[PDB]
Design a protein around this motif. Structure first.
Motif: not given
Ligand SMILES: CC(=O)CCCOc1nc(Oc2ccc3c(c2)CO[B-]3(O)O)c(Cl)cc1C#N
Ligand SMILES: [Mg+2]
Ligand SMILES: [Zn+2]
Length: 323
Positions: A113-114, A143, A184
């Motif tokens: 996710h990062d 993202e 996110t």
């Protein structure tokens, strides 16, 4: 070394596993270590027919694409969010709700996710006319980038961990991972929370006390909110862990503020090291973002998140008293 790591991994399925110690005893490879532990624990390698070689090779490459020189958004944070997502997936109120594919997708989403985070916000990249901001029209810039890197690494040699999924499973997992990683983005926070509140207001519960989800939209909205909760989970952990996360995020925030100052830009909130208060920022962040989210999550899965919400409120009041 090996016995120490094994002792830390006794808390694999628990909230507040010490991922910092896991990083120490795995020689700064917390994401590869914790993901291998999680996948073995859930039988995910067996179920989806992923070899240990293929999984380790992908995970090592993924972890290499996290920036070691950034304070917060590195592989330790990714490992923390993956392990927290792994715990949330096993919350009693969601027992037998999600499929194996949904479980796989959520933990994978959390892991990637990062990936390839530069250590600056979306607003920084937009205001500096970055190539990434241009590519994605200022919409979920980082993202979208995290997804692009996470998926492209699957095409590297001996890295396709989804090779033995069916075509429909591969297509559906792709969609769900995109949904959870895009969730996110803080720009979608209020919309996600509004949908979470709607599901809480109209929730259907069994005699045993398990949440009932009628359609795909309800399932993915819970999964979107779950990864978002895991991403914003630092203030709900034990205070000694939370303080370490706070030290790292402020270091990264002050580095962006230094970049903004030397470029002649307006310094972002919480990023001016000369004026900003660490304690006030956390209390404000908890009150306006983290507590509304977790209180609504706690209502959805009641009483399973009771100790987590108590910890969040205690940490909020502790930080407030240190102002
Ligand atoms: C100890 C902590 O609790 C730090 C939480 C992260 O610090 C913040 N993040 C915020 O927004 C994002 C939340 C999640 C993420 C990002 C930005 C970029 O990548 B990511 O997925 O990690 C906002 Cl609005 C405030 C703070 C504060 N303080
Ligand atoms: Mg992010
Ligand atoms: Zn994150």
């Amino acid at each position: 070394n090996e016995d120490h790591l094994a002792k830390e991994l006794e808390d694999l399925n628990k909230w507040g596993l010490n991922i910092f110690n896991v990083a120490g005893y795995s020689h700064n490879r917390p994401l590869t270590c914790i993901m291998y532990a999680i996948f073995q624990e859930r039988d995910l390698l067996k179920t989806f027919r992923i070899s240990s070689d293929t999984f380790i090779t992908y995970m090592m490459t993924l972890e290499d694409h996290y920036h070691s020189d950034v304070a917060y958004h590195n592989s330790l944070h990714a490992a923390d969010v993956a392990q927290s997502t792994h715990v949330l997936l096993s919350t009693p109120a969601l027992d037998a709700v999600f499929t194996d594919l949904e479980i796989l997708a959520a933990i994978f989403a959390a892991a990637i996710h990062d990936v390839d985070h530069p250590g600056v916000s979306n607003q920084f990249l937009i205001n500096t006319n970055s190539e990434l901001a241009l590519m994605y029209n200022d919409e979920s810039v980082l993202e979208n980038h995290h997804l692009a890197v996470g998926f492209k690494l699957l095409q590297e040699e001996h890295c396709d961990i989804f090779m033995n999924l069916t075509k429909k499973q591969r297509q559906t997992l792709r969609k769900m991972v995109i949904d959870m990683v895009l969730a996110t983005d803080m720009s979608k926070h209020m919309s996600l929370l509004a949908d979470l509140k709607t599901m809480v207001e109209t929730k259907k519960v069994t005699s045993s006390g398990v949440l009932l989800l009628d359609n795909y939209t309800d399932r993915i909205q819970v999964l979107r909110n779950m990864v978002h909760c895991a991403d914003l989970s630092n203030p709900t952990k034990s205070l000694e862990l939370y303080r370490q996360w706070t030290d790292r995020i402020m270091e990264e925030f002050f580095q962006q503020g230094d970049k903004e100052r030397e470029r002649g830009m307006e310094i972002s909130p919480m990023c001016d090291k000369h004026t900003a208060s660490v304690e006030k920022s956390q209390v404000g962040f908890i009150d306006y973002i983290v507590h509304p989210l977790w209180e609504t999550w706690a209502d959805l899965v009641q009483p399973d998140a009771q100790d987590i919400l108590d910890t969040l409120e205690d940490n909020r009041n502790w930080y407030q008293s240190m102002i």
